[PDB]
Design a binder for this molecule. Structure first.
Ligand SMILES: [Co+2]
Ligand SMILES: [Co+2]
Ligand SMILES: [Co+2]
Lengths: 112, 112, 112
């Protein structure tokens, strides 16, 4: 019934997971230079993001319906799922930032 | 297969968000007296509740499918989304009770 | 587009609730010996598990779509719903492990 809501420059919020992934893509395809191209490819299609790291295998990162929201399948650290706590994404299993998991794993490759 | 469950005075639980909103409506349309009618209207239709506060703009409060459950769009403090912690509703972003956000904002109007 | 993901021995993850319930069933139908058969039956069909405890009434335990995931209806302690925290399931209301609720309630029967 109210109008003084839809004459605002109105907008559907983003999906909180969607926003993480897009920020990860340009953070990661930027890191897709600091390899001797031994982390050669990262692609994101429809909330599925694949990350080729030949040293370990291939990563798959998902948007997922909840008992939680972002799903990580690590060729190295295994599978894990994450939901928002205080505005960072966190393992339901134990509570670790996936930011940290990815961070560590990515840079364990740069060593090689 | 068991009967001694359905000869109980049986009942579908409520939606936890639904219960919050109904409690907010009579808490707020009661506060729709303690204004010099400068918070003139509050309506709740189908899990959408609008709150007119001319001083700031119009509030919209939603039931929402999860990465969390109650969605707040504040003409003043902006958007935010909330899920249950220990039986109160809490910003996924930072962890603040929306009870508090609403409380503060409502009474920042009573000042005027 | 990537193959070196689907020539892995691939697998859909389980539902975190599903895994809890299956572990509860054999933990409970094992306890369906340590009664003077006064906790005579426990059945699990399609993510609905019923538990007959004549002393108190019948329990129903559910897989549920979220503002949380496992739903408990206790003939004794009432209803409650639970989501993962740090890999254990926890009352949204107050934060107690349902493991504990069930544990206590089950063994309050063994007293009799
Ligand atoms: Co969480
Ligand atoms: Co929460
Ligand atoms: Co929780």
């Amino acid at each position: 019934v109210p109008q003084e809501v839809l004459n605002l420059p109105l907008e559907k919020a983003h999906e909180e997971a969607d926003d993480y992934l897009d920020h990860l893509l340009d953070s990661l395809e930027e890191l897709s230079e600091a390899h001797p191209d031994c982390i050669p490819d990262v692609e994101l299609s429809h909330g599925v993001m694949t990350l080729e790291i030949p040293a370990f295998g291939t990563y798959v990162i998902n948007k997922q319906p909840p008992n939680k929201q972002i799903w990580l399948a690590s060729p190295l650290s295994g599978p894990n799922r994450f939901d928002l706590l205080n505005g960072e994404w966190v393992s339901l299993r134990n509570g670790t930032k996936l930011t940290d998991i990815l961070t560590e794993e990515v840079e364990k490759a740069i060593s090689k």
